[PDB]
Amino acid sequence: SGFRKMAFPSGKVEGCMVQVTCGTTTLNGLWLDDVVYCPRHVICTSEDMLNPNYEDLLIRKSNHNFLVQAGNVQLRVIGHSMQNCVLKLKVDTANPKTPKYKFVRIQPGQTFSVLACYNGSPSGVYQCAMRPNFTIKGSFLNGSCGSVGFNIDYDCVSFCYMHHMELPTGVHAGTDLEGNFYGPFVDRQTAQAAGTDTTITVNVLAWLYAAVINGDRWFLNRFTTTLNDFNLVAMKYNYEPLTQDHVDILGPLSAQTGIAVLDMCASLKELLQNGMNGRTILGSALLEDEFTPFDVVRQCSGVTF
Amino acid sequence: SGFRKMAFPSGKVEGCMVQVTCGTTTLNGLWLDDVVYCPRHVICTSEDMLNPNYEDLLIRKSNHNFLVQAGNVQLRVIGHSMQNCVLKLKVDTANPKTPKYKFVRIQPGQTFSVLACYNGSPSGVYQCAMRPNFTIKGSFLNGSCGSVGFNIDYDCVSFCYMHHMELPTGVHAGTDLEGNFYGPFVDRQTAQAAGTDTTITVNVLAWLYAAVINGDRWFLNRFTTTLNDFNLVAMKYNYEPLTQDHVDILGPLSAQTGIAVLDMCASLKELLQNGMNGRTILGSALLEDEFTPFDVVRQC
Ligand SMILES: */C=C\C(=O)N(Cc1nc2ccccc2s1)C1CC1
Numbered sequence: 001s002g003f004r005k006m007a008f009p010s011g012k013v014e015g016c017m018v019q020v021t022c023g024t025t026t027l028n029g030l031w032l033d034d035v036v037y038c039p040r041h042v043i044c045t046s047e048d049m050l051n052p053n054y055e056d057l058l059i060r061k062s063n064h065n066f067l068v069q070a071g072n073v074q075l076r077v078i079g080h081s082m083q084n085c086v087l088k089l090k091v092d093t094a095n096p097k098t099p100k101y102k103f104v105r106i107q108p109g110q111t112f113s114v115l116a117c118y119n120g121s122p123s124g125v126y127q128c129a130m131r132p133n134f135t136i137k138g139s140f141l142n143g144s145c146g147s148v149g150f151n152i153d154y155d156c157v158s159f160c161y162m163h164h165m166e167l168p169t170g171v172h173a174g175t176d177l178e179g180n181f182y183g184p185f186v187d188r189q190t191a192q193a194a195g196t197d198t199t200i201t202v203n204v205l206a207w208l209y210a211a212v213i214n215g216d217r218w219f220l221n222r223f224t225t226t227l228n229d230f231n232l233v234a235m236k237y238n239y240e241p242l243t244q245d246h247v248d249i250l251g252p253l254s255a256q257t258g259i260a261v262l263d264m265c266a267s268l269k270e271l272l273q274n275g276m277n278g279r280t281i282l283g284s285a286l287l288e289d290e291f292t293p294f295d296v297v298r299q300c301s302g303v304t305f
Numbered sequence: 306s307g308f309r310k311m312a313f314p315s316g317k318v319e320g321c322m323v324q325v326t327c328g329t330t331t332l333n334g335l336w337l338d339d340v341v342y343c344p345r346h347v348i349c350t351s352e353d354m355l356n357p358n359y360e361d362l363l364i365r366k367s368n369h370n371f372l373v374q375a376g377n378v379q380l381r382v383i384g385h386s387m388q389n390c391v392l393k394l395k396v397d398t399a400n401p402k403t404p405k406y407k408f409v410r411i412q413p414g415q416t417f418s419v420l421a422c423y424n425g426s427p428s429g430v431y432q433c434a435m436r437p438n439f440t441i442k443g444s445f446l447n448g449s450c451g452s453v454g455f456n457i458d459y460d461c462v463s464f465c466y467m468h469h470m471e472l473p474t475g476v477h478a479g480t481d482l483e484g485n486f487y488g489p490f491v492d493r494q495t496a497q498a499a500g501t502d503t504t505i506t507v508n509v510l511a512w513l514y515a516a517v518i519n520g521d522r523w524f525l526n527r528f529t530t531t532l533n534d535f536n537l538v539a540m541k542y543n544y545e546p547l548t549q550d551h552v553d554i555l556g557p558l559s560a561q562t563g564i565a566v567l568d569m570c571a572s573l574k575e576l577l578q579n580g581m582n583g584r585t586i587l588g589s590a591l592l593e594d595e596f597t598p599f600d601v602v603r604q605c
């Protein structure tokens with residue numbers, strides 16, 4: 001038993017990370033088939049990033065302006081292109097380590113694993129969630145640009161995130177792998193704030209079910225509530241509304257414990273009243289909202305890849 | 306910026322995970338060169354888990370009593386032997402994916418990554434710490450025995466933990482890769498219980514420094530302490546004594562932030578007395594003790 005925040009094994013993705021340098025900027029690239037993906041702002045100068053004209057910045061560059069380095073082997077670039085905010089670099093040779101993969105775009109409240117890299121060499125791996133305000137609370141230092149997020153289904157890697165920038169609030173912003181930003185963000189050095197975060201309600205309830213599956217029962221109670229009554233108290237504590245589809249998805253965990261979702265909502269309702277104040281659940285003094293229902297089930301049932 | 310519990314990239318260990326079957330029991334093994342390592346209790350039957358004599362069980366075994374699978378491939382065992390609590394299966398093929406590696410024995414407070422596996426197949430990776438009572442607070446369903454913990458430095462994998470057992474209290478015990486248990490535990494299913502656990506004080510201080518490095522100072526105060534008066538207070542909160550060696554270990558983080566170690570000790574002293582008062586540190590509403598001083602500089 002036990003319950004930790006668990007990242008997907010990262011080996012399928014480790015073999016796809018390369019170093020991409022365009023004139024004194026260096027960040028990370030994703031090498032799949034014969035194409036290397038990376039943030040388009042790698043073509044920006046430290047003076048062009050205030051208000052970049054990306055059409056004109058790319059039309060000036062040609063293939064020789066990009067050095068791609070896979071470990072210590074140089075990759076010769078034979079074509080360059082832009083799709084939304086990602087730069088596509090076509091290379092001489094295809095990646096022999098290319099996994100079965102698929103570009104997907106995730107909803108807020110879904111989790112994924114991030115392979116943090118620096119100069120194209122993977123450094124660490126962690127589990128994070130796409131926040132309702134479309135940021136992630138990651139760990140990224142200078143030169144982590146281009147690190148990707150992903151999930152694994154059987155043997156297929158779903159790439160869902162590429163890291164572009166840090167917001168002044170410390171949180172991070174990026175795109176899917178087709179270059180579309182998550183959230184209302186642009187790739188410029190301009191003041192950009194995110195909306196007020198809210199809490200992913202359905203993940204909080206799923207984590208509470210993982211608590212009772214591990215013996216933590218002191219927060220339970222008998223009084224049920226209505227969906228309308230709960231959504232009103234969720235409104236006041238900046239919790240996301242709980243939809244009827246969230247209750248259905250929580251169906252499995254409601255069975256495995258015999259606690260109705262709306263019973264758990266009163267447990268969560270009362271926990272939102274005067275709090276925990278040092279009282280803990282699964283070793284946490286706050287309510288954790290970065291575990292999906294599928295995460296709770298895949299860890300309380302041992303699915304591998 | 307940002308500070309997260311971060312595991313090492315698991316790719317170099319994924320290539321070493323195999324499945325070891327003996328009689329009716331299947332667990333994970335570690336295929337390095339032409340040797341496979343697994344917990345020795347793989348040779349136990351149902352009447353063999355209270356008081357097994359492992360020497361007697363192993364002498365009755367032929368090579369073909371051990372089935373080893375690496376994916377679809379069946380590896381042929383050409384010899385077996387035992388080192389403390391680890392069984393070593395010599396196979397006819399050296400693992401082509403064997404990384405540069407070392408076996409190391411860690412000390413309480415040290416962190417490592419766990420590659421949880423089921424049936425030789427890697428399921429997930431996470432960071433955890435060797436607790437002062439020599440257990441780990443892992444995530445380990447049945448049939449995850451033989452999952453290993455590790456660190457990676459440059460491109461050399463230091464293996465430090467093999468999982469063997471879950472204890473009545475829900476926490477986990479295992480050995481180094483020479484088969485010697487961490488703590489006073491034996492691979493028998495007779496009643497065993499971990500000693501009382503304590504917070505890893507030197508790790509909490511490193512995490513406070515990491516909070517200052519990431520831009521939070523609200524928990525500092527104007528006070529200092531002596532090493533002795535800190536230890537007298539901390540132990541009333543179930544905290545590990547802070548030795549002189551620990552404060553030397555925190556010297557680099559101290560120089561980087563400009564805050565003396567004993568001043569941060571006064572800070573921790575007050576946090577234990579007051580709580581957070583509705584605030585959080587690096588995303589947490591309690592004091593975090595599974596980040597070493599080395600973990601902190603690698604992530605900041
Ligand atoms: C990922 C490392 C990093 O922070 N930088 C700094 C930059 N931030 C932005 C934001 C918007 C557009 C362009 C850039 S560059 C990097 C060198 C890559």
Ligand SMILES: */C=C\C(=O)N(Cc1nc2ccccc2s1)C1CC1
Nearest residue numbers: 346354447448449450470492493494
């Ligand atoms: C690998 C699964 C696991 O940990 N267990 C618990 C066991 N403890 C011991 C102790 C001594 C000898 C053998 C075993 S197995 C089991 C499913 C059985």
